[PDB]
mmCIF file of C-alpha atoms (C1' of nucleotides) and ligand atoms in Angstrom:
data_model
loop_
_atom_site.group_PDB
_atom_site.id
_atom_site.type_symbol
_atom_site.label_atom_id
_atom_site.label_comp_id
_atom_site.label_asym_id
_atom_site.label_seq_id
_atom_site.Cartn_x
_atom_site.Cartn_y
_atom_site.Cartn_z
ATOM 1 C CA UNK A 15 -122.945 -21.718 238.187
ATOM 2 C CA UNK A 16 -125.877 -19.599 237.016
ATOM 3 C CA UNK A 17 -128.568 -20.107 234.346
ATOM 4 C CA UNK A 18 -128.146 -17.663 231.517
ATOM 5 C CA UNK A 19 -131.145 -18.255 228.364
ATOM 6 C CA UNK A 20 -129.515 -14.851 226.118
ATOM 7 C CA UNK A 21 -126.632 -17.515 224.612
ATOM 8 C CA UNK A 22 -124.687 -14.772 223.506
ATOM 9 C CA UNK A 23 -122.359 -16.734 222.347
ATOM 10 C CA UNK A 24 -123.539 -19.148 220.225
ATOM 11 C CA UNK A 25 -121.905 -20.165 216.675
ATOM 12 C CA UNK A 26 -118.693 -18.868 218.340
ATOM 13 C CA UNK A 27 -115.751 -21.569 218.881
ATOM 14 C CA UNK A 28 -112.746 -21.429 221.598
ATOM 15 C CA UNK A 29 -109.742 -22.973 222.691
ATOM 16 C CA UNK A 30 -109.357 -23.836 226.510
ATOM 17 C CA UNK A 31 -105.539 -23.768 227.503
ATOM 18 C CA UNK A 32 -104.427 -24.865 230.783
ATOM 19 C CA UNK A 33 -108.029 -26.270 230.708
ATOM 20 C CA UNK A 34 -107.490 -27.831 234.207
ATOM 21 C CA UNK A 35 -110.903 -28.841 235.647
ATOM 22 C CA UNK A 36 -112.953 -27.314 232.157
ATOM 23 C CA UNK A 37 -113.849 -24.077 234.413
ATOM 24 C CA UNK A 38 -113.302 -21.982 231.620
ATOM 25 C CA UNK A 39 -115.333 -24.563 228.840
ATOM 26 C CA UNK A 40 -118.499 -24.949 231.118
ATOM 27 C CA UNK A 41 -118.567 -21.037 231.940
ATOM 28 C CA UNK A 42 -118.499 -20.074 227.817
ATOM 29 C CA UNK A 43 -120.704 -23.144 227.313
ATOM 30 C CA UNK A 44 -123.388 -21.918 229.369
ATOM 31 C CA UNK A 45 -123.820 -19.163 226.829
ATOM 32 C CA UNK A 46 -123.898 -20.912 223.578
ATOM 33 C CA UNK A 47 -119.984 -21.377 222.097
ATOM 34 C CA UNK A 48 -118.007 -24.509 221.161
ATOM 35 C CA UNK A 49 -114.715 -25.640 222.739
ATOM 36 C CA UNK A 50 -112.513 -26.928 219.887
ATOM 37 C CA UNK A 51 -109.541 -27.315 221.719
ATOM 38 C CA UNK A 52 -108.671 -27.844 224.768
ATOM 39 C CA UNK A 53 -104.818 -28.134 226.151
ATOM 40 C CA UNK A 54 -104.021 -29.579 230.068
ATOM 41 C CA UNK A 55 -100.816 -31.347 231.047
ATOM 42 C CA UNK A 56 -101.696 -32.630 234.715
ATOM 43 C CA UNK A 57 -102.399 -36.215 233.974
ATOM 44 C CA UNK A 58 -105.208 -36.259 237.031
ATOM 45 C CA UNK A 59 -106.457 -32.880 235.095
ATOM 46 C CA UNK A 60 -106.809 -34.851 232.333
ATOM 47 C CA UNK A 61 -108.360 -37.956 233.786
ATOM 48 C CA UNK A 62 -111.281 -35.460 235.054
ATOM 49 C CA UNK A 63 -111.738 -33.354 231.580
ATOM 50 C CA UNK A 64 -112.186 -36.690 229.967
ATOM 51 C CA UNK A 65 -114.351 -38.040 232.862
ATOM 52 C CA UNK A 66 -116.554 -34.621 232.031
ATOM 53 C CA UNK A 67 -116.013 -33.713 228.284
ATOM 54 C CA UNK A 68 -115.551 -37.051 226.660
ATOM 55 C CA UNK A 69 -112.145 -35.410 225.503
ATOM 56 C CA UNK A 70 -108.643 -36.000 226.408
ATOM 57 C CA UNK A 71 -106.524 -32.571 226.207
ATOM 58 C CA UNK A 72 -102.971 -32.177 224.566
ATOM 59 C CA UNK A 73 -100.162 -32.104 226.212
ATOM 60 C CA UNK A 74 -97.017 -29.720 227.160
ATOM 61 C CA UNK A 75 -98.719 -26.697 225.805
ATOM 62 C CA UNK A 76 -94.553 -25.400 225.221
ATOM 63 C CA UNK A 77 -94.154 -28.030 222.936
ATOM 64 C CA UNK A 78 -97.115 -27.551 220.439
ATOM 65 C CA UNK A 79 -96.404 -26.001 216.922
ATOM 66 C CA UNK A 80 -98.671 -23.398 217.602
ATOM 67 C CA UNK A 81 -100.012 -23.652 213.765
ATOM 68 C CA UNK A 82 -101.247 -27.038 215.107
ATOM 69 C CA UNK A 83 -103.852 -24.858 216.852
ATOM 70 C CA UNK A 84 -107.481 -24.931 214.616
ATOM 71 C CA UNK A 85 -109.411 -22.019 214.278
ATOM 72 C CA UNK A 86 -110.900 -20.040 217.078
ATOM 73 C CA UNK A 87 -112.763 -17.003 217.800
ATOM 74 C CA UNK A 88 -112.369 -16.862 221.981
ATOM 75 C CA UNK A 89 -109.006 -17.564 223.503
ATOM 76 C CA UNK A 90 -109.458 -18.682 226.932
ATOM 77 C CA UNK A 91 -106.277 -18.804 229.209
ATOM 78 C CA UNK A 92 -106.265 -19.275 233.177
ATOM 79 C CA UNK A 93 -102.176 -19.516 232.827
ATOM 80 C CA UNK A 94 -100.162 -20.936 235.919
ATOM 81 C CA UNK A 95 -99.647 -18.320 238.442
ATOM 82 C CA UNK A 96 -97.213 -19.710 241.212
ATOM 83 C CA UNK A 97 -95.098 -17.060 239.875
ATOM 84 C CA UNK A 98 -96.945 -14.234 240.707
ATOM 85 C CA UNK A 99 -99.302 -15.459 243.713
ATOM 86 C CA UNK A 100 -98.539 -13.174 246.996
ATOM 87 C CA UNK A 101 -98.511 -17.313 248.647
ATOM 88 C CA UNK A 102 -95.167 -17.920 246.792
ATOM 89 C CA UNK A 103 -91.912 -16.758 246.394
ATOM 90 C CA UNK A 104 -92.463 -13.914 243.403
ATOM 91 C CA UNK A 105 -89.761 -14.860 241.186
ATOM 92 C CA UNK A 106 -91.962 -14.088 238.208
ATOM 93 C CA UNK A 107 -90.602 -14.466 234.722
ATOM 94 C CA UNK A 108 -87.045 -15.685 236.130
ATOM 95 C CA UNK A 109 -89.425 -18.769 237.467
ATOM 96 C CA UNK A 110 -89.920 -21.507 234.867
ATOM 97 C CA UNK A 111 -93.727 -21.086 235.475
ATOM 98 C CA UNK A 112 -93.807 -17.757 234.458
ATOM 99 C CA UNK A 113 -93.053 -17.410 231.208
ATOM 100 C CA UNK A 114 -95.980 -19.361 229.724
ATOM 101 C CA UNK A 115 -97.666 -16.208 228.998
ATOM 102 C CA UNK A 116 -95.194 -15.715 226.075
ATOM 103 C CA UNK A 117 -96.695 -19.109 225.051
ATOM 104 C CA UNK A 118 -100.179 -17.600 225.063
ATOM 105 C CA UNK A 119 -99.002 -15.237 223.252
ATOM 106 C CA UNK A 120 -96.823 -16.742 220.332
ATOM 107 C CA UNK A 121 -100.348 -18.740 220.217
ATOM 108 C CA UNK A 122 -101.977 -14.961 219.316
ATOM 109 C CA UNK A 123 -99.585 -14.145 217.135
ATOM 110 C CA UNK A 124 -100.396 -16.981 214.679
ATOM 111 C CA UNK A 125 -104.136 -17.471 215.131
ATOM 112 C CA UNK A 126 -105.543 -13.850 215.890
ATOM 113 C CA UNK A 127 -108.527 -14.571 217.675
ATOM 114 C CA UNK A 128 -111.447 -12.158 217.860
ATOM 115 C CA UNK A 129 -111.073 -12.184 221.891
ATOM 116 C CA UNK A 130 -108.293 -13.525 224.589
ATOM 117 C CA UNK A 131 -109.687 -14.187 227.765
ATOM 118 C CA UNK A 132 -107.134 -14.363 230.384
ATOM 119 C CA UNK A 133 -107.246 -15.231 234.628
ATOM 120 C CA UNK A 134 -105.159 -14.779 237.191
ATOM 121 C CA UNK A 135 -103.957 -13.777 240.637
ATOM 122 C CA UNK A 136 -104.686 -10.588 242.390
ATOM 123 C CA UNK A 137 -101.051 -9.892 243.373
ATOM 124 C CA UNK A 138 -100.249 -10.159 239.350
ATOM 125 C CA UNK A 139 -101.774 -6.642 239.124
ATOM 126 C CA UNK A 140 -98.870 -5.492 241.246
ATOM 127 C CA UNK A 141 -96.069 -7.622 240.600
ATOM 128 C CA UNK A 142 -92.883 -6.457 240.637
ATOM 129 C CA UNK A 143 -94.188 -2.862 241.036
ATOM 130 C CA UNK A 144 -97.059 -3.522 237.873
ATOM 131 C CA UNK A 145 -94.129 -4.472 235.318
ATOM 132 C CA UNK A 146 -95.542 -7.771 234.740
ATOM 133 C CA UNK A 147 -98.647 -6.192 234.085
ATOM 134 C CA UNK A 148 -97.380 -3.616 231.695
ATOM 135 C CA UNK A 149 -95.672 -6.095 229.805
ATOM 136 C CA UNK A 150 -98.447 -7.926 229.132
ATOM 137 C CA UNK A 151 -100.437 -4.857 228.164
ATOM 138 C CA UNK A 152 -97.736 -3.691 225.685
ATOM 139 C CA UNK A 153 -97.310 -7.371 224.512
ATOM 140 C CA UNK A 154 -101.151 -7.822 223.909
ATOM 141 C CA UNK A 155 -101.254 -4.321 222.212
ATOM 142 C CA UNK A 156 -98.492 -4.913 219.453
ATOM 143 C CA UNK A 157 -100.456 -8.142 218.331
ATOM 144 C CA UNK A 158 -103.662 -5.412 218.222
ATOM 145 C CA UNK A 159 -105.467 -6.118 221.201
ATOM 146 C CA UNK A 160 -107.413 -3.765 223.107
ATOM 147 C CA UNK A 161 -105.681 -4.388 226.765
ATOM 148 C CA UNK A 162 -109.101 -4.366 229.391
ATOM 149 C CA UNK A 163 -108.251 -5.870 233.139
ATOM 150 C CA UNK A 164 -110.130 -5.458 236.651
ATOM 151 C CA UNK A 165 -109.850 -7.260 239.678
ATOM 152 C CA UNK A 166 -112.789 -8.826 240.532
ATOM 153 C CA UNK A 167 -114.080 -10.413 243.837
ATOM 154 C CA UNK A 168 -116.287 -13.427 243.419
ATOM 155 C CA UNK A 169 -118.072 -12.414 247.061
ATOM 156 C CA UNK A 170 -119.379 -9.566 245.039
ATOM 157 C CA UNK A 171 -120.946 -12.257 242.480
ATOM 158 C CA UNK A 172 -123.101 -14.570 244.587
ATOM 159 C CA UNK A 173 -120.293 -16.745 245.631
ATOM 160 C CA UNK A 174 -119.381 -16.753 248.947
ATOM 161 C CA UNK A 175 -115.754 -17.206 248.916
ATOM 162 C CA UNK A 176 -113.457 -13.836 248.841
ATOM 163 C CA UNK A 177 -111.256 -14.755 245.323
ATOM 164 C CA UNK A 178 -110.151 -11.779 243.981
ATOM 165 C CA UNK A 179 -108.979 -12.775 240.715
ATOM 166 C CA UNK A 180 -107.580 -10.432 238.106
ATOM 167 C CA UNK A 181 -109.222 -10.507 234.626
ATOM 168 C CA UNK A 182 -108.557 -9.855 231.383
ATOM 169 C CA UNK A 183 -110.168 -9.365 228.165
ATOM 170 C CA UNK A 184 -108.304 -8.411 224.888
ATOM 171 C CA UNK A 185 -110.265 -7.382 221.539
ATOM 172 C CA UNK A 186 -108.414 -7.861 217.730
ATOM 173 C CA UNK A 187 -108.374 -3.826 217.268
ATOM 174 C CA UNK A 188 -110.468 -4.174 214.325
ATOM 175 C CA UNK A 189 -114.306 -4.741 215.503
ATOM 176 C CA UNK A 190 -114.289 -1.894 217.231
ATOM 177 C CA UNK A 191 -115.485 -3.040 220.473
ATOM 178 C CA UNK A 192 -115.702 0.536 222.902
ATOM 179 C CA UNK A 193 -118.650 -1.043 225.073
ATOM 180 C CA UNK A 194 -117.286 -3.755 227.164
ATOM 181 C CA UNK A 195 -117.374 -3.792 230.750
ATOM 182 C CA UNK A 196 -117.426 -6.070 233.462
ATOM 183 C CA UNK A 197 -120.115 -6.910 235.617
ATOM 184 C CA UNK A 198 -121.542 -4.442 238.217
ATOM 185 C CA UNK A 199 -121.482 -6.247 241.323
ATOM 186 C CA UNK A 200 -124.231 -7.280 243.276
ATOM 187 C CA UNK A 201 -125.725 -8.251 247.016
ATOM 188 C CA UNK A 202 -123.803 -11.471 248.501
ATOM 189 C CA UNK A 203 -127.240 -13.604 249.817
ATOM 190 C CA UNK A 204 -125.954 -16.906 249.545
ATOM 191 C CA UNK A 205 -122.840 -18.027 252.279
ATOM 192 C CA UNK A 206 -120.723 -21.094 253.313
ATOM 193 C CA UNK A 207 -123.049 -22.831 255.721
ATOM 194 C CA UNK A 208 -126.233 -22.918 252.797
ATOM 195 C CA UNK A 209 -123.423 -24.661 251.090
ATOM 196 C CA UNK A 210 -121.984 -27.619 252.992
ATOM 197 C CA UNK A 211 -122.909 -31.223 253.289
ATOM 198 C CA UNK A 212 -125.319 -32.990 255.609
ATOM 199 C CA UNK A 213 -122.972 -34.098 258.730
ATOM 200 C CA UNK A 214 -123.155 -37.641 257.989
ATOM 201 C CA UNK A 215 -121.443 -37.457 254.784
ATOM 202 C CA UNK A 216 -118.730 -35.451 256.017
ATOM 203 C CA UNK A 217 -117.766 -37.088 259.551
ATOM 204 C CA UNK A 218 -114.365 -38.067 258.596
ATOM 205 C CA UNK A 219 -112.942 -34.709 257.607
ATOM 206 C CA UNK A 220 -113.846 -33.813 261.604
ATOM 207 C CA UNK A 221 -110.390 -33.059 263.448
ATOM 208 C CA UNK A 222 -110.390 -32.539 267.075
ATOM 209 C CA UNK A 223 -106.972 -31.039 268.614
ATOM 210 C CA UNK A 224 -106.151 -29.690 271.587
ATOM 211 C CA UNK A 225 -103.578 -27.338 270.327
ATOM 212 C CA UNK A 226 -107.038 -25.756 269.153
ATOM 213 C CA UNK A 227 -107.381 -21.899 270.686
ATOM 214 C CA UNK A 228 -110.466 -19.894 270.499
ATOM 215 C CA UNK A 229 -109.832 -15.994 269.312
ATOM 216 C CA UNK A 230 -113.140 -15.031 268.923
ATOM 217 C CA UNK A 231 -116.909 -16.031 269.223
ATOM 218 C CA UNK A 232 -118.657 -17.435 266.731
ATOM 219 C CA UNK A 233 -121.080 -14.934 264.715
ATOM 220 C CA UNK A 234 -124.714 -14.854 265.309
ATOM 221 C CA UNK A 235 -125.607 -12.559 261.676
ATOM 222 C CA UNK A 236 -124.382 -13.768 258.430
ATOM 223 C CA UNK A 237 -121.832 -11.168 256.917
ATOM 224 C CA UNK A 238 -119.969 -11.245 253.716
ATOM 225 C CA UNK A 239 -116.437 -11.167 254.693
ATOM 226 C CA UNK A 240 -114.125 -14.094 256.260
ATOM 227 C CA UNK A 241 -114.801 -13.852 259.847
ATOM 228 C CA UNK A 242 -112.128 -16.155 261.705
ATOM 229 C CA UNK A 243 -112.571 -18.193 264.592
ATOM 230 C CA UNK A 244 -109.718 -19.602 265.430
ATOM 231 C CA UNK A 245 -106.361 -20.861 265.387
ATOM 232 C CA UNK A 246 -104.610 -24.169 265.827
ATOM 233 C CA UNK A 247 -100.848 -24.498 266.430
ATOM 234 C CA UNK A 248 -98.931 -21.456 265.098
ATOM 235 C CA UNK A 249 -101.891 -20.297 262.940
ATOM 236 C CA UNK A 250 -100.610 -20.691 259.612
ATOM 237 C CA UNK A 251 -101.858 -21.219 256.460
ATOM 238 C CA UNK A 252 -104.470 -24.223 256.965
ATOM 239 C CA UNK A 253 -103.996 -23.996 260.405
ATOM 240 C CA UNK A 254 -106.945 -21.048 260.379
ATOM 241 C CA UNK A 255 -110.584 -21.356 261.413
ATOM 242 C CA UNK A 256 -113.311 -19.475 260.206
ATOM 243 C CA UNK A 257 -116.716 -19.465 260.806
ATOM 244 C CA UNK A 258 -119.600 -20.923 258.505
ATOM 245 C CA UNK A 259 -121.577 -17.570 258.655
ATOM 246 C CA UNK A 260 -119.563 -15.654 256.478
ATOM 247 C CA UNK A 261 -117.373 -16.529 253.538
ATOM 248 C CA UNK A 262 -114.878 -18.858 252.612
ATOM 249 C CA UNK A 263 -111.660 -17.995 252.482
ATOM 250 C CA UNK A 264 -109.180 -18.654 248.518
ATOM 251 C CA UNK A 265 -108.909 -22.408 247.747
ATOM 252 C CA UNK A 266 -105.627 -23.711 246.803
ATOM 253 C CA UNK A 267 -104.046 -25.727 244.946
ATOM 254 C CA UNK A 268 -100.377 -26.807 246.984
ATOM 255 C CA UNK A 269 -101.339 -25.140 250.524
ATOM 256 C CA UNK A 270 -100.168 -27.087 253.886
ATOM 257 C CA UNK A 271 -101.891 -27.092 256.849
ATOM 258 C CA UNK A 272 -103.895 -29.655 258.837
ATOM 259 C CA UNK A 273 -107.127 -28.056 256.707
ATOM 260 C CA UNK A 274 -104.760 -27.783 253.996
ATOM 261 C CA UNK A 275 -105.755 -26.594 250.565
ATOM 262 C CA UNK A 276 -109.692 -25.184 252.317
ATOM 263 C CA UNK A 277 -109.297 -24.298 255.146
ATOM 264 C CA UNK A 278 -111.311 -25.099 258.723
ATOM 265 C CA UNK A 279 -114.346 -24.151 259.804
ATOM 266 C CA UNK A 280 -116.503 -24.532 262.997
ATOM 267 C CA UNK A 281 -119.166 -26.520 261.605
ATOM 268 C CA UNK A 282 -122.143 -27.834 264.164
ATOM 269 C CA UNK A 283 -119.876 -27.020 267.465
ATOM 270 C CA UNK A 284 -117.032 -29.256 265.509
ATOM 271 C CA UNK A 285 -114.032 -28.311 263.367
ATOM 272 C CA UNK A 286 -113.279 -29.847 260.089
ATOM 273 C CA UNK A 287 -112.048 -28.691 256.405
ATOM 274 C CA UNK A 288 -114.444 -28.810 253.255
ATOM 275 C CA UNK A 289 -115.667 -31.748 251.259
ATOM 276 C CA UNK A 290 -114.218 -32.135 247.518
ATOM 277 C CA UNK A 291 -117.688 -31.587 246.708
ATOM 278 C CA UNK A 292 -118.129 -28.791 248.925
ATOM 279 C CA UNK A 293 -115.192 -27.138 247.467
ATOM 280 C CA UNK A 294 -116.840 -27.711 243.913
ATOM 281 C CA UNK A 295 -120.077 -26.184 244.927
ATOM 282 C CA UNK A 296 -118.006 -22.572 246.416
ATOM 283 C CA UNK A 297 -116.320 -22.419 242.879
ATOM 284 C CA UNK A 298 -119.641 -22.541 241.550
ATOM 285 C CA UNK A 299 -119.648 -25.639 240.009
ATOM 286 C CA UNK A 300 -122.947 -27.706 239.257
ATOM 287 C CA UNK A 301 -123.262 -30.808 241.528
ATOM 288 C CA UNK A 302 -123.373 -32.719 238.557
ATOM 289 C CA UNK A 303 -120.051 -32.024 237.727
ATOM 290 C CA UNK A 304 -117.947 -35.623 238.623
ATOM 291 C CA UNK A 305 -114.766 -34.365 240.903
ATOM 292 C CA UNK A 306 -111.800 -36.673 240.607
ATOM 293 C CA UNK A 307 -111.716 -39.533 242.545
ATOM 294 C CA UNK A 308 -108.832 -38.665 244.788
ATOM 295 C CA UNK A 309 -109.268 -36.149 246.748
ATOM 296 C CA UNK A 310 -106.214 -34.497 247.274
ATOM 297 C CA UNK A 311 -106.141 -34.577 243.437
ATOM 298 C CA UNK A 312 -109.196 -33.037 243.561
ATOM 299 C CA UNK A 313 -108.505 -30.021 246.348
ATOM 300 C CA UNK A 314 -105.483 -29.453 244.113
ATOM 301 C CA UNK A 315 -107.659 -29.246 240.954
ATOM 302 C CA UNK A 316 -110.354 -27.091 242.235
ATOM 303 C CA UNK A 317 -107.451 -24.999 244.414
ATOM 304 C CA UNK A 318 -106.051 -23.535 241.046
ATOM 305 C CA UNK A 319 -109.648 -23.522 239.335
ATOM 306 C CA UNK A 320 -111.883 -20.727 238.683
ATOM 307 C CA UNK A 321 -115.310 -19.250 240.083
ATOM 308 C CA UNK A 322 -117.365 -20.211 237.569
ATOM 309 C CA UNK A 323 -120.584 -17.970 238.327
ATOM 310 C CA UNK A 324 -117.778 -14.624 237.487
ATOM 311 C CA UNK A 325 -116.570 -16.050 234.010
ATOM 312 C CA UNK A 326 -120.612 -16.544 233.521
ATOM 313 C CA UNK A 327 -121.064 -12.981 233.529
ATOM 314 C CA UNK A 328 -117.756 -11.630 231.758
ATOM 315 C CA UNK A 329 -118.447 -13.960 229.123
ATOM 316 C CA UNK A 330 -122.298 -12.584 228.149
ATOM 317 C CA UNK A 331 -120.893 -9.382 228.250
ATOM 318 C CA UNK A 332 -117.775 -10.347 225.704
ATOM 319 C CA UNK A 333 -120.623 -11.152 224.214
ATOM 320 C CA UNK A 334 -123.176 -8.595 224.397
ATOM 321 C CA UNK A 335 -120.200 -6.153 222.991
ATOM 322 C CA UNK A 336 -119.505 -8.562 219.960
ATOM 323 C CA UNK A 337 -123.393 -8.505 219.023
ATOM 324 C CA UNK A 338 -123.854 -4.597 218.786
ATOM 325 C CA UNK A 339 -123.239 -3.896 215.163
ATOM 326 C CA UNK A 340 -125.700 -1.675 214.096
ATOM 327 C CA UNK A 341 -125.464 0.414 210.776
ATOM 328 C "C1'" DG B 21 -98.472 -39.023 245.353
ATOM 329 C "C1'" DA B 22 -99.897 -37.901 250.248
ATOM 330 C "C1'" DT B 23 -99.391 -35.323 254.174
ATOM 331 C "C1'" DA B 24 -98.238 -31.433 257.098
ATOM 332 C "C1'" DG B 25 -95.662 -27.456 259.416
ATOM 333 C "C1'" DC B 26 -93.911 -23.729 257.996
ATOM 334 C "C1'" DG B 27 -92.226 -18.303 256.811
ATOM 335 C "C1'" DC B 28 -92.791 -15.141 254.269
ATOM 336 C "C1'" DT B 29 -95.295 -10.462 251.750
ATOM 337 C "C1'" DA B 30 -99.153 -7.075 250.736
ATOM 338 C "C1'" DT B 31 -102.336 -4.432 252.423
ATOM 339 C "C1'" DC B 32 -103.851 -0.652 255.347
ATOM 340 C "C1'" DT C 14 -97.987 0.137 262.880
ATOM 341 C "C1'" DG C 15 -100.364 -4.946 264.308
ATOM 342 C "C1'" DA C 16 -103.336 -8.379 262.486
ATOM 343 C "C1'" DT C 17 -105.014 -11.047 258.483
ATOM 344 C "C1'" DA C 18 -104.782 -13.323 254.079
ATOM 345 C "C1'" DG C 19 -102.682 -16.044 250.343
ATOM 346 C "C1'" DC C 20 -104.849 -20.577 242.436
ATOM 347 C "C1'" DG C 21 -97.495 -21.529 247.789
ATOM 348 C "C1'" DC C 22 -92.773 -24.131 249.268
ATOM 349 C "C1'" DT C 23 -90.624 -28.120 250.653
ATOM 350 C "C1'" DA C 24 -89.125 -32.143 253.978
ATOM 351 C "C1'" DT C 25 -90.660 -36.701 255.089
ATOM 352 C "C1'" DC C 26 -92.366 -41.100 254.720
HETATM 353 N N1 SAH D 420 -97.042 -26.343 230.037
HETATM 354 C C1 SAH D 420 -98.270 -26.692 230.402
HETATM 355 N N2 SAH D 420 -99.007 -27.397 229.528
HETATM 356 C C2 SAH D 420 -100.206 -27.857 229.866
HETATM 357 N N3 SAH D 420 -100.838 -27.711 231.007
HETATM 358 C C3 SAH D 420 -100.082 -26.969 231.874
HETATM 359 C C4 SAH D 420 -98.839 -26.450 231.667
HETATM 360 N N4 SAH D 420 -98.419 -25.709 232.765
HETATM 361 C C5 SAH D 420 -99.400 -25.770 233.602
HETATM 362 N N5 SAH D 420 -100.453 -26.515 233.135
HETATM 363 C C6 SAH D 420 -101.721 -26.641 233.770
HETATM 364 O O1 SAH D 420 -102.220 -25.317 233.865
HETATM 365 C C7 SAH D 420 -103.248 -25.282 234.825
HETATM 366 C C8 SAH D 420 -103.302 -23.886 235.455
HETATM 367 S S1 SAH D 420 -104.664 -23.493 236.595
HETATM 368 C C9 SAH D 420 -106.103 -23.244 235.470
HETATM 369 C C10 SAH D 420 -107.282 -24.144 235.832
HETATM 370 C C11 SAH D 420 -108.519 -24.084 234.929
HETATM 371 N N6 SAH D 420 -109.090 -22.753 234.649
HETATM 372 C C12 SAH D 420 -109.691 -24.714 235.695
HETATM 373 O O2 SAH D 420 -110.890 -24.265 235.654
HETATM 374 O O3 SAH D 420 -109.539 -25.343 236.813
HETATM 375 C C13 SAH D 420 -102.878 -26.413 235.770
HETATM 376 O O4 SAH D 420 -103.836 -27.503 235.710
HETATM 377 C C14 SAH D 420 -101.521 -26.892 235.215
HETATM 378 O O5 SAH D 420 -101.311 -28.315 235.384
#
DNA sequence: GATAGCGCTATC
DNA sequence: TGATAGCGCTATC
């Protein structure tokens, strides 16, 4: 995450659904607003949130009366997306995990927020040929929402890891917010190997197999795209090895693979998959933040978590647009 | 609840 | 195309 001292935010209060690790609290916290509600099901999800908030989050988000809901300013949303995710078979809405959405938004319909601030995956821009997308425009739209997406690239934000997320920020139609934008991009300076662990702390994630093939050399000048290395086995996912010079490639949350859920990389000569902790710190996350204490809980977590550094940004500008009320 | 080996689709 | 990537799917213990 990234410092910000213009809390453009502050005296505002949101609700953090499908709260997961608290990606979305500590990103809108970092600019002065107040989470005062928070809803995760994942009991390990939960065990974390508590471990880091002091608060325990509701449960089955389908099964909350949504006038149960206090009042909030800032809806903040990072709904499921093995629906939608180019990794999984795309049934969309037909899937039982894809219809939460329509949860978000029966949520809308009662409390009218000022702002909904919704994540997702890239391939949701396109799904089934951009319906998906449309009907979620329309839908936002009839509850009076300004409808404003982009896909954004967290390489492009000082992280290096190549997440392109979609975004997206509805306004009540009232405050006439025609100023919003998202974040002009910037220089990538900071890559994978300024980010992992001394070597004695992560020794036993080192795997050494001889199925192990070489398809290229490793890099000698640091370059902000995934540059891989090699292969192991049939070179599937988590069976891919990239090289610590340039950038990490999208955590997940259920991936396979003998690096399942981060990947490999050729780290000192040797080939291993990131530290929880690691992980954490290519999300953006401070190293103060306490990760779960098992850790394929806590790949999974931070697998379907969010770059914090991006929300950062989007958030002072949500911001910065809800400030400008001049006469 | 952990672990892995897959098998597909989008993108260009 | 031909090569890479993916907040994944699912059998097994
Ligand atoms: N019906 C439901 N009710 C509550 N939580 C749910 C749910 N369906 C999915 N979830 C939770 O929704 C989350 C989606 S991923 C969002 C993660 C969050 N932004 C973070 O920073 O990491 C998952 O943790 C999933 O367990």
């Amino acid at each position: 995450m990234i410092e910000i001292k213009d809390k453009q935010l502050t005296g505002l209060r949101f609700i953090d659904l499908f709260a997961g690790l608290g990606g979305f609290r500590l990103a809108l916290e970092s600019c002065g607003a107040e989470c005062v509600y928070s809803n995760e099901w994942d009991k390990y999800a939960q065990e974390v949130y508590e471990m880091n908030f002091g608060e325990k989050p509701e449960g089955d988000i389908t099964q909350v009366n949504e006038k149960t809901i206090p009042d909030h300013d800032i809806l903040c949303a990072g709904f499921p997306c093995q629906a939608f995710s180019i990794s999984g078979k795309q049934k969309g809405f037909e899937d039982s995990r894809g219809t939460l959405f329509f949860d978000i938004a029966r949520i809308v319909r009662e409390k009218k927020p000022k702002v909904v601030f919704m994540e997702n995956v890239k391939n949701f821009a396109s799904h089934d040929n951009g319906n998906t997308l449309e009907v979620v425009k329309n839908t936002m739209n009839e509850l009076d929402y300004s409808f404003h997406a982009k896909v954004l690239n967290a390489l492009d934000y000082g992280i290096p890891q190549k997440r392109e997320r979609i975004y997206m920020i509805c306004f009540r139609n009232d405050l006439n917010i025609q100023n919003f934008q998202f974040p002009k991009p910037f220089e990538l300076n900071t890559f994978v190997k300024d980010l992992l662990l001394p070597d004695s702390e992560v020794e036993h994630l080192v795997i050494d197999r001889k199925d192990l093939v070489m398809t290229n050399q490793e890099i000698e000048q640091t370059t902000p795209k995934t540059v891989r290395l090699g292969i192991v086995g049939k070179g599937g996912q988590g069976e891919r090895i990239y090289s610590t010079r340039g950038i990490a490639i999208t955590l997940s949350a259920y991936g396979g693979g003998i690096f399942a859920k981060t990947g490999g990389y050729l780290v000192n000569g040797k080939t291993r998959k990131l530290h929880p902790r690691e992980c954490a710190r290519v999300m953006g996350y401070p190293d103060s933040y306490k990760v779960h204490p098992s850790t394929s809980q806590a790949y999974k977590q931070f697998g379907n978590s969010v770059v914090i550094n991006v929300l950062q940004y989007i958030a002072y500008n949500i911001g910065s647009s809800l400030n400008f009320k001049p006469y």
